[PDB]
């Protein structure tokens, strides 16, 4: 768990020089899923 | 037969996929209908 695929949303990830494609959908985009450090918000 | 450069294409025009696309096609395509 770390990166993701725009269309076939499938937790992926990797490190340096591991190309930049997904495991199936070539679609070379990829996002970066939330943080585990929970965030707080003022409620107003 | 031969390759001579590249022509940018106007969106929503004949030569653009979006042209024949429909409601559902787009939303999947991510483009806004």
């Amino acid at each position: 768990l770390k990166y993701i695929c725009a269309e076939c949303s499938s937790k992926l990830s990797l490190s340096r020089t591991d190309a930049v494609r997904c495991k199936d959908c070539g679609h070379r985009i990829l996002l970066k899923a939330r943080t585990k450090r929970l965030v707080q918000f003022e409620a107003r | 037969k031969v390759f001579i450069g590249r022509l940018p294409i106007m969106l929503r025009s004949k030569n653009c996929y979006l042209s024949e696309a429909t409601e559902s096609d787009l939303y999947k395509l991510k483009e806004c209908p």
């Binding site: 993701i4 725009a6 269309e7 949303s9 | 939303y27 999947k28 991510k30």
Partner: protein
């Protein structure tokens, strides 16, 4: 873009009443002007709130991940 919870002007709850109203429309085949009166939305401050909201979210939801 989901129903505004409460009315800007007077603060009177209005979040609930979205679904209700949308039925007294399609189903109960009523007219906006009364569907509202039916739901206790007396004065326009609250009125203008529902009669105008454009529930874009529905169109948003229709995307993907």
């Amino acid at each position: 873009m989901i129903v505004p919870v409460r009315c800007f002007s007077c603060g009177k709850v209005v979040g609930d009443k979205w679904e209700s109203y949308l039925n007294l429309l399609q189903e109960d085949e009523l007219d906006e002007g009364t569907a509202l009166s039916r739901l206790g939305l007396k004065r326009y401050c609250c009125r203008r709130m529902i009669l105008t909201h454009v529930d874009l979210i529905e169109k948003f939801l229709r995307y993907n991940p």
